[PDB]
Amino acid sequence: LAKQEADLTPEMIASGSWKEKQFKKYNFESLGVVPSSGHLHPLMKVRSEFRQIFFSMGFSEMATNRYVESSFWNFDALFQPQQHPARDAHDTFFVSDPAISVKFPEDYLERVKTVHSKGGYGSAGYNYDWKIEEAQKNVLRTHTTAVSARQLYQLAQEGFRPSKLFSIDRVFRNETLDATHLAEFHQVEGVIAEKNLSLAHLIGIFTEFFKKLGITDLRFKPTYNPYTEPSMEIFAYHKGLAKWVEIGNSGMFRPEMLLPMGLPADVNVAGYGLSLERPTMIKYGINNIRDLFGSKIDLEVVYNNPICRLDK
Amino acid sequence: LAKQEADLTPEMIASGSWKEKQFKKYNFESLGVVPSSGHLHPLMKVRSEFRQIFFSMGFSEMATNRYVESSFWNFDALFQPQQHPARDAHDTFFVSDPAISVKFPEDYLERVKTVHSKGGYGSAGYNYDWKIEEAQKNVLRTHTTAVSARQLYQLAQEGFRPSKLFSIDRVFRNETLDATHLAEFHQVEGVIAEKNLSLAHLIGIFTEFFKKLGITDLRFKPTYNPYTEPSMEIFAYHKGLAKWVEIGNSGMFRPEMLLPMGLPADVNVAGYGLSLERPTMIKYGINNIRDLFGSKIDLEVVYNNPICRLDK
Amino acid sequence: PTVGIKKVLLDKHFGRVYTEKEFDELCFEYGLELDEITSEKAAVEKERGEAAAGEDLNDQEVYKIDIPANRYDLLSVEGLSRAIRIFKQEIESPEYRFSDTKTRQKIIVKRETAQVRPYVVGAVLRDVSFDSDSYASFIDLQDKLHQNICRKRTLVAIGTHDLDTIQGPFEYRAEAPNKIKFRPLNQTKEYTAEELMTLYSTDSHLKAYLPIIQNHPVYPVIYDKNGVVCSMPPIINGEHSKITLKTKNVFIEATATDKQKAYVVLDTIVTLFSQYCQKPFHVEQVEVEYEETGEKELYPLLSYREMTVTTPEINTKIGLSLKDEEMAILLNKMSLKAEVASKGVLKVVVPPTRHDILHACDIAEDVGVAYGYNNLVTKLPESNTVAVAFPINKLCDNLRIEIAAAGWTEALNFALCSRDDISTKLRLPDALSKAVHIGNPKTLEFQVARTSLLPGLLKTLASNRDMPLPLKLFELQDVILKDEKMDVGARNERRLAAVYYNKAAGFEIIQGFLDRMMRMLNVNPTKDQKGYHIEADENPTFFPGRCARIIGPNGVFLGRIGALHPEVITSFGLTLPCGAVEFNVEPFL
Amino acid sequence: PTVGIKKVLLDKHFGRVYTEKEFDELCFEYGLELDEITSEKAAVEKERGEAAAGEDLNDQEVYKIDIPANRYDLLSVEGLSRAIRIFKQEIESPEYRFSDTKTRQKIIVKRETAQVRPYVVGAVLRDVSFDSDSYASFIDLQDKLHQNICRKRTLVAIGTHDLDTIQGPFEYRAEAPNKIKFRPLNQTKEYTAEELMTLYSTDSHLKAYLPIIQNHPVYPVIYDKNGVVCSMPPIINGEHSKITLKTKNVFIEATATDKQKAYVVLDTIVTLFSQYCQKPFHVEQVEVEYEETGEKELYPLLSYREMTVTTPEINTKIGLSLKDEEMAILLNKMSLKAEVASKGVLKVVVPPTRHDILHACDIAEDVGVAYGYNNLVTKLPESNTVAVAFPINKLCDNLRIEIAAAGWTEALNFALCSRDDISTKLRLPDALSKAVHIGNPKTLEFQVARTSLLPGLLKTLASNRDMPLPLKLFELQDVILKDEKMDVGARNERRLAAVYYNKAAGFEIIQGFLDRMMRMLNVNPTKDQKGYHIEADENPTFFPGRCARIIGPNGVFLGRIGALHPEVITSFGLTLPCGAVEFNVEPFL
Numbered sequence A, B: 001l002a003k004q005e006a007d008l009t010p011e012m013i014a015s016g017s018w019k020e021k022q023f024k025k026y027n028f029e030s031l032g033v034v035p036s037s038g039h040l041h042p043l044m045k046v047r048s049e050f051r052q053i054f055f056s057m058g059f060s061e062m063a064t065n066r067y068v069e070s071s072f073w074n075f076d077a078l079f080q081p082q083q084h085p086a087r088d089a090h091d092t093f094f095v096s097d098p099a100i101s102v103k104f105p106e107d108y109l110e111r112v113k114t115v116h117s118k119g120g121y122g123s124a125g126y127n128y129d130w131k132i133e134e135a136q137k138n139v140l141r142t143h144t145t146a147v148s149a150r151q152l153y154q155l156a157q158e159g160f161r162p163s164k165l166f167s168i169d170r171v172f173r174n175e176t177l178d179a180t181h182l183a184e185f186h187q188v189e190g191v192i193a194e195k196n197l198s199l200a201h202l203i204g205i206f207t208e209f210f211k212k213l214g215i216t217d218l219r220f221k222p223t224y225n226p227y228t229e230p231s232m233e234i235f236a237y238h239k240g241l242a243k244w245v246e247i248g249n250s251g252m253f254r255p256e257m258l259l260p261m262g263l264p265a266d267v268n269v270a271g272y273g274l275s276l277e278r279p280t281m282i283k284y285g286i287n288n289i290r291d292l293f294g295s296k297i298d299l300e301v302v303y304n305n306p307i308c309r310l311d312k
Numbered sequence C, D: 001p002t003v004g005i006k007k008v009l010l011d012k013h014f015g016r017v018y019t020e021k022e023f024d025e026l027c028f029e030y031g032l033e034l035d036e037i038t039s040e041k042a043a044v045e046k047e048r049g050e051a052a053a054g055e056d057l058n059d060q061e062v063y064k065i066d067i068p069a070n071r072y073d074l075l076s077v078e079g080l081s082r083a084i085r086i087f088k089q090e091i092e093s094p095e096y097r098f099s100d101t102k103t104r105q106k107i108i109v110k111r112e113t114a115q116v117r118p119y120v121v122g123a124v125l126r127d128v129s130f131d132s133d134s135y136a137s138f139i140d141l142q143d144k145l146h147q148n149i150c151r152k153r154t155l156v157a158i159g160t161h162d163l164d165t166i167q168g169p170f171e172y173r174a175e176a177p178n179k180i181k182f183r184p185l186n187q188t189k190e191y192t193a194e195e196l197m198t199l200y201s202t203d204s205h206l207k208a209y210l211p212i213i214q215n216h217p218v219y220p221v222i223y224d225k226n227g228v229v230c231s232m233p234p235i236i237n238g239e240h241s242k243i244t245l246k247t248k249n250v251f252i253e254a255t256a257t258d259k260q261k262a263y264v265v266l267d268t269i270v271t272l273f274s275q276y277c278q279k280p281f282h283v284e285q286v287e288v289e290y291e292e293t294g295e296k297e298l299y300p301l302l303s304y305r306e307m308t309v310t311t312p313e314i315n316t317k318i319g320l321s322l323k324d325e326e327m328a329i330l331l332n333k334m335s336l337k338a339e340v341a342s343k344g345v346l347k348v349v350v351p352p353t354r355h356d357i358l359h360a361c362d363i364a365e366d367v368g369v370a371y372g373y374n375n376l377v378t379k380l381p382e383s384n385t386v387a388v389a390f391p392i393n394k395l396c397d398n399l400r401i402e403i404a405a406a407g408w409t410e411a412l413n414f415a416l417c418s419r420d421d422i423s424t425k426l427r428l429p430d431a432l433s434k435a436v437h438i439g440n441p442k443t444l445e446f447q448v449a450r451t452s453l454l455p456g457l458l459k460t461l462a463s464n465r466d467m468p469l470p471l472k473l474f475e476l477q478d479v480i481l482k483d484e485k486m487d488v489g490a491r492n493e494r495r496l497a498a499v500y501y502n503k504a505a506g507f508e509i510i511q512g513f514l515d516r517m518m519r520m521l522n523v524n525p526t527k528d529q530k531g532y533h534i535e536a537d538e539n540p541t542f543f544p545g546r547c548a549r550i551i552g553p554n555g556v557f558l559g560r561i562g563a564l565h566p567e568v569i570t571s572f573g574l575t576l577p578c579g580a581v582e583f584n585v586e587p588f589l
């Protein structure tokens, strides 16, 4: 062919010789050179979006860099009896070194022991012998409600004021090698504490929260949770399978884990929560979670990842 | 020297020959290779930070892609008389093509004309002959209060509810070639509308807003503004010059530009505002604004720009 | 807990045949969940894998139903059907009473038993009428209780015997291992404790229960009057006291170290299966006395617990406006007998079948389930608490983060410019017909408002010409266009523009940027009206043969891309080839 | 408006000598602003530039004071000093009245004047006592009024004449240009209208005022009884009626097309300079009649305006709790005479010097200025309306955006790992002394919690080994460490780690990443205890001679950086050189 370069040389621009020579036809059906870019993680993008939503609704972030936790805050402070299937060693990691924690607020621990072993505050308890040596043990936290209990106790000690808090962090559960679930997963939780709070207010709050996620119609089913009463489970219609699918849960904490802290009798604390991997898998169309989390992650999924338009 | 390469070859790692040959001493006083990165603009970073602060305080963003505006909304709707130095052609750009806008809400325009030419709603007016041909002309907006007036009228038409709004966009002023100021600048404004609002509430609101900016102690000075009464100007102590420096302004809109819209007599609308270039210049240590805005921008400033830790 | 129940058994107990959808809706209303449906033939066929096919069992369907962990009376069809039928207001809630008997059974506890298993309770069911299905249900209930609440038989153990095959006041001893010898269940010859442990060491089902009392110096044991080993808890029962379908009287006993769970388990068992008695819902008591202390107790308890709640608190916690009588009637559907004492105060009586009611909040959840969670009127938060962003700004911010990640630097320019920049330098003589003109400028630079973002980027390149190559600047901002249909005659359009300045500015370099920007917006390169594409075009401001027009979804024109004309380059002072792209981003909103 | 006033004149009028700081504080209290201080000698010296030095004027200092645009009585020292002294409660507020006179001046308006300048007002000041300074102030006030409110004399024009040099009832005619001829001010020979326009065409000061009435067929003119041209507004006055220091009576007139601004200007002028009269604060009226209509008016007005406000509205708008009497006394300091009628209702009388009080809100601003804006008790918003982020998360997010911009891909790994990964593969035999051990793992992979982020990145590299090079992964997450001083014995530390995997992994490539990360955190590479640096170190997990320790501000150890040992590479399955860096990011918080 002729001098038909894909571009004009600077000499041609300077001398004005571009009007005497032909140029090569360009194939407009092809694709260009892919730029070398830096990428984020889809789970981190979803976490940032959730944080922005919580900030826009008026929630203050909590400190959740407390993976190792004593059994007192994780179980006993939440009114889970020591001899029930909830506190089983089959699904909870136990720490051997260090094994025990010794320093606790004595008065609060005494009140917790009294409510567990004899009852009170209009309750009946379990009339079993509460043992301190059981609460001494250290475990990896199975849920973020321990941090919420710590924050509520701290708020009650220094005077009460209405509050809205949220947390998004890892939790650990003891599971065998399978594909249904992993040993660690990120849990999103939001807590609202104020006077004369009702279940309808909570319904409206998470209805608004899910409306910002692109979900409009919701249904509710009764369920059971050890530390919340009443409790419910949220379902949304899915057109890909044409059926109702569970999406999250909520509930109001029991008075037996609030009055010993010191909160006023007129204050109701409610909360709701969900996971983080399920919405990400639904949005981005991901089948196997191990392709996204862990050492077996597929980087091609990370590279070709669009922005998080979760409202779409 | 010896085979003292700066690195081990993959052959050396595979064959384990790294323990028979010396390596070259590395100068730890030097610097490494600068990565090729993409950069943002400091003004855009500051704008994003301001947007996040406004969202965290509960303000809803407004639509400000309306550079060209009729003189009715820009001046007449804000109760600025047509024969006063405020509406001078010396500092306002005027549009020649297109020149006029014809479609206005007739009833609202009639009420505005009545209040301008005769007075009412407990006011005295200016008893001058209001001319529609003056309001027909199109200008480039000199402030973002026109968008606020549009939003307030729309809110009043469809029923009132407490609201918090904000806007950050360009405004235009007619200036000669100098160094003190430019013809365009970004103006940050926030508006709060609710029942029985007081000046103390506004003081608290912008006190919190500036506390998130790293400014603690403030002082107030009386000032004059055509469409707000009472009005004030905010000063903060500066240690670099050891003197008090003006940082922003605030005020509550006049009843003569609210009652014709249709707002209830019990609703008070307040607002505050500031610029965007001054905090950026103070934070990043920039002397000449033209090195940051316009076609004469210095890219070395953009490249070596740290993140916006405005709370620091 | 998961309970498998035959479909025909469900039809018999409920009284009507339910389809799958009706039963699923009924489960959704109450809180249960229909996990799976599988015929018992197919259940055996695919229980250990479809290869191990077993069709020797019933071909009737079996439903797997999930039960709440704190509900104990829903572990068998007898309690589940009763609860559901009371919920739908089919039958009246039963009442449990004590049957008068002049001769009560007696258990005497020895002192040494305080070392291992210090607590024991018991009850008697009289005139039973077991059949093929009720016996299997009776065994399954014990299995579930031993697997869930008894904590793998570590805390509580249950034993059942025939009351007629044995006789006399029973004794609970803790003799030495070598002092006990009897014939085990399903065994021929007799064994001692050590022989029994050796025999069951290699077993599978009973292997795990051995270490419970393996290391203790003494073993628990139960004897009748005539020195017959009734059972050796918690390991196995006695063959002489085996219970079969011909039995008419059952003696139930529970040995435990935790006293409360024994009460719960005994009450659950004695209430679930008291209907099969010849006199329905009637049990006789058993007396237990401890020799060490000399105290006497009677079992079972059948505890009805009285609570006092307040209506305003329930309404505030739930978010309703129910009256006293409405709340009482609503609670009557949940097996709770509620009675109004005065205004705002309600007296509730919890039956023995409900051992999960500790606080008033449990009653509140009951009154919320009876009313229905989908009939609550929500109350949304106030508008001035939720902040809504402007959608185009949010999209632009998210896109700009990715643009920076790609390696492009952001710039900023003025909105006002001169006529020569947007008309003559761009080789567009007619461009002035669409721009907005300014009447009174103070300089020969603010004549018109910009219609394209290219001149700003080109001038910024001209200013910073001495910086090292390549220079990759971008800008996404508004442009002003004339539109007659608008209120004022002009409108703002958000556009994204980018340039690539270097000694070589091939079409591929900027085409890749376009492709990446499209990928980040989740639009695939397809020609089927759902994706974007490009096609050849002619435009004065772009070099011939290197200009293309961008068509987005639904055949919408978006912008342009290509190499700039040499005259456009020289009109801004530049001297090197530059590639450019500019397109609208409002359609993607 | 900016007003320049001599310092000695300020001292004379105020009554006491103020220092610069006292005057600046006084301005800050009331709302003014002291722009600049310059002696009139220096003012002339540097007015046109320091090169054009003029020292022929007074060496006394002159203050430049900024005046609010809606305040008209503060345009001269006479009004400014009066307002400030009333504000500080030094003197009583003056009262303006009318002086009785049996012979009033008269102005007769002709019909043709309705074509150009249809409105005229007037007043007379009697028994004036002007001196050197008051005359200059009188001229300066007229200059300011003509420059600001009169809109460059387009709307209103002011003229002053000596009442004794002229006599007779005045007439306001609109004769033709060729019908008027007189001697202009500061001129020798007489001129006509056309000659006057030709003469002033090339002038500078009067050039701009000509096009006001240049094209009209007729020109305004004022005549006395004896056919003497008093003035030709709005161009110039008559030489015969010039006013000098010897004048004892002044006639002030205003010609306008806008009727309200004429009232405002006349009231301002007649109130500011009524103190210099032999009878202070007393003016006599002038009658103006229109021939076309036959109506008669008297001027000036001296309008006292009565308003009725409500105390609760003022308190709600301002945010106070003042009583009625306190608010009245507070308003009395702002030249307003306030009187209480009943409870919650206040009657206010605005004097003619205040022509900026239109609505009650103006009174509210007055009551807020008198009280003081720094004495208001603020009321902060509720805590559950403001959202506060966790600082480390915010810093990490902002830093991660820049890390992505640099070209590094993010990864994610598990928190739990095995002993071999963190102890043996990293060539750290003692590393187990600091880790946290797990008691009951279900697999040989969850023995301990991770103490370093390197194994996760290395395993992720191993999985994706087949992807094209180079691979640049990063991760900033928490690690668990054992600490005895903690509540539970362990703590979480946020660390940032990054790797660079390629056939060549020079120290420079990762050192540049470290430098960029430090730059984005605003820390310079200095050795003066305020910046970061690196120095040689020995560590088993890094290759000898390529390991360094990072020292941050205040000599705080941060982490490590360098090339990994070949054994560490081979222990994870990798086969190519890799560079790594890991450091804490909590000190930068």
Ligand SMILES: [Mg+2]
Pocket (backbone or CB within 6 Å): C356, C362, C365, C366
């Ligand atoms: Mg319940």
Ligand SMILES: [Mg+2]
Pocket (backbone or CB within 6 Å): D356, D362, D365
């Ligand atoms: Mg005022």
